[PDB]
Design a protein around this ligand. Structure first.
Ligand SMILES: Cc1cc2nc3c(=O)[nH]c(=O)nc-3n(C[C@H](O)[C@H](O)[C@H](O)COP(=O)(O)O)c2cc1C
Ligand SMILES: Cc1cc2nc3c(=O)[nH]c(=O)nc-3n(C[C@H](O)[C@H](O)[C@H](O)COP(=O)(O)O)c2cc1C
Ligand SMILES: O=C(O)c1[nH]c(=O)[nH]c(=O)c1CCc1ccccc1
Ligand SMILES: O=C(O)c1[nH]c(=O)[nH]c(=O)c1CCc1ccccc1
Lengths: 313, 313
């Protein structure tokens, strides 16, 4: 009957927050997410300098979900750090800051500056391993040695508990390798599964055209298309990383979808496409709907069912 | 107006066929696919010996698609070779035979034996590369060195044009690398994109349980979930393999979905989940619906629009 929880030395009114990138780029957006009923908020992944991002149109949504190739538009790390150190009202809810530098050095340079603000104000770091395509090498989370370098360097530079935003994997050996990398780093205290399902292509039959301008129409998919992919990643890393938290992201449109993420192992549940489409009112509905399912089942706490998805035999 | 194609030295009344695995395991199944209005059929991916596959339930479907961990149940190579050599009526439509040996040596042994029947009767080989190799390693087509080995060995042992069935990829680096491997092999004349989107997890909220028994509920996804992933892969290989055909598979439930595949580059268009759910009557419906879109647009043949998806500016 209340959905409050405690994680990472912080108190949360409920497990919901925006997904990085959605409703979180400008001061106005971050004030809007803080005024909402969400339990937390995360800022737009940032780079050391500001970015315009890719040409428009760069996001489109449809009944089954969304496609985007935003290009990491952001107001620059100095802005997000300033929001964290001077503007955010911590009495309202916790703040996560997402960083997405284009090299290890850039990520290390941002985290060294974020550390004392984390100590003083309690902002939390979500390190985004996804990045614009560089011909000739894979995304960082898809190159396990690069991933290990990033986490070794960030962990050294930051020195405090943080989390990592992961793209989906689709192969059980990949789950085993990625979770073994993550388990080398004791400061990685949460894993957020998942970022968009990479490089889909939506085509409009009437116009015979792709629907976004960058990358010949290819972009990451979110929303209903990706819920079972998201639940599989959440559960695969919940099972493999027993000393970490898993934050679930992907496909959440209802309190039933949140319930499924929590059954698979999610501690917080992030909302991307559905929030972009419905606006911040969605958080009161998701809370009501999750409490309604809990009540029908007799559950009084999230702990009673987190990670307790049943297998057959 | 017409749906006819002539490719790989065969004539097809229309581009539709089953996806491997669906309606194609027994003699009864293959006679049913032959009696349908599809333009071709493919047999179930086989191994040297018969397999019972995994325990049930191992396939389930829902409004947005399906999940399966079948375990490669099949009647064994000798049965499908007999069907191709002695039973199929080639005056009705062309036959593809899919193989999925559990090692390069098993595939080599099958294709050596298939070769003389392919030469005499015109059966076409589809080699499934989205298939287990050594457990704890990724599936073959996610291990580029293994994939190259499989292709070198099968190309030497078989010596005739064949095609390959590919898992989806999600990273531009992988589209680049995979297409470069395929383009090393001139006998690979068609590339079928895509197999299921691997290791998703469907969870039923009422029962709090996964819905298939093997693999703790993890399985490959088909259907509406995967259409933009399928289209991205069809187009990515269509652009990168200009000397090969691309066949599309994933998410086809209507003539409009088939039209989008074909705009992305697809020659043949395969139907898995929707055919499993609706039965072979789907082919008359897909042909009617694709001809209606062609009529409205004034297209008289498939080559007028195949691969002609527009990009923005
Ligand atoms: C418009 C847009 C911008 C996004 N930007 C980011 C980002 O800056 N950093 C990040 O970690 N993920 C980003 N994402 C990914 C989302 O955080 C989320 O992982 C993905 O959309 C899946 O969740 P959903 O199904 O709720 O949309 C973005 C997604 C969208 C739709
Ligand atoms: C029950 C079932 C069995 C399958 N078995 C095979 C197989 O033996 N070989 C293979 O190449 N693909 C197999 N697949 C994958 C399908 O061929 C197809 O690639 C996938 O289902 C996506 O197409 P769809 O969205 O139309 O279902 C199977 C799919 C299903 C649902
Ligand atoms: O800003 C984006 O395009 C973006 N969109 C996503 O769905 N997830 C992300 O993490 C990002 C920022 C990193 C990124 C990823 C792919 C292409 C460009 C930037
Ligand atoms: O028989 C299968 O489970 C199967 N299902 C698919 O959706 N696609 C396939 O290619 C196969 C056969 C290969 C496979 C894949 C994963 C585990 C075992 C066999």
């Amino acid at each position: 009957m209340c959905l409050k929880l405690n994680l990472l030395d912080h108190v949360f009114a409920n497990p919901f927050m925006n997904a990085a990138g959605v409703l979180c780029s400008t001061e106005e957006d971050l004030r809007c997410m803080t005024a909402s009923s969400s339990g937390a908020l995360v800022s737009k992944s940032c780079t050391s300098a500001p970015r315009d991002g890719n040409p428009e149109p760069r996001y489109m949504a449809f009944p089954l979900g969304s496609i985007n190739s935003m290009g990491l538009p952001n107001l620059g790390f100095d802005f997000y750090l300033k929001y964290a150190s001077d503007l955010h009202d911590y009495s309202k809810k916790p703040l996560f800051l997402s960083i997405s530098g284009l090299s290890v050095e850039e990520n290390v340079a941002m985290v060294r500056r974020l550390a004392p603000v984390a100590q003083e104000k309690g902002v939390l770091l979500e390190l985004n391993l996804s990045c614009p395509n560089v011909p000739g090498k894979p995304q960082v989370a898809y190159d396990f040695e690069a991933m290990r370098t990033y986490l070794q360097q960030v962990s050294l530079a930051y020195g405090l508990p943080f989390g990592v935003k992961m793209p989906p994997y689709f192969d059980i050996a990949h789950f085993d390798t990625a979770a073994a990398v993550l388990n080398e780093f004791p400061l990685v205290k949460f894993v957020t599964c998942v970022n968009s399902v990479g490089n889909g292509l939506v085509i409009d039959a009437e116009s015979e055209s792709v629907v976004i301008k960058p990358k010949q129409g290819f972009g990451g998919l979110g929303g209903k298309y990706i819920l079972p992919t998201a639940l599989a990643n959440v559960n695969a890393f919940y099972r493999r990383c027993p000393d970490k938290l898993v934050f679930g992201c992907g496909g959440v449109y209802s309190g039933e979808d949140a319930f499924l993420h929590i059954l698979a192992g999610a501690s917080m549940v992030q909302v991307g496409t559905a929030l972009q489409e419905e606006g911040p009112g969605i958080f009161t509905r998701l809370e009501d709907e999750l409490l309604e399912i809990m009540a029908r089942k007799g559950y009084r706490t999230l702990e009673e069912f987190r990670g307790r998805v049943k297998t057959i035999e």
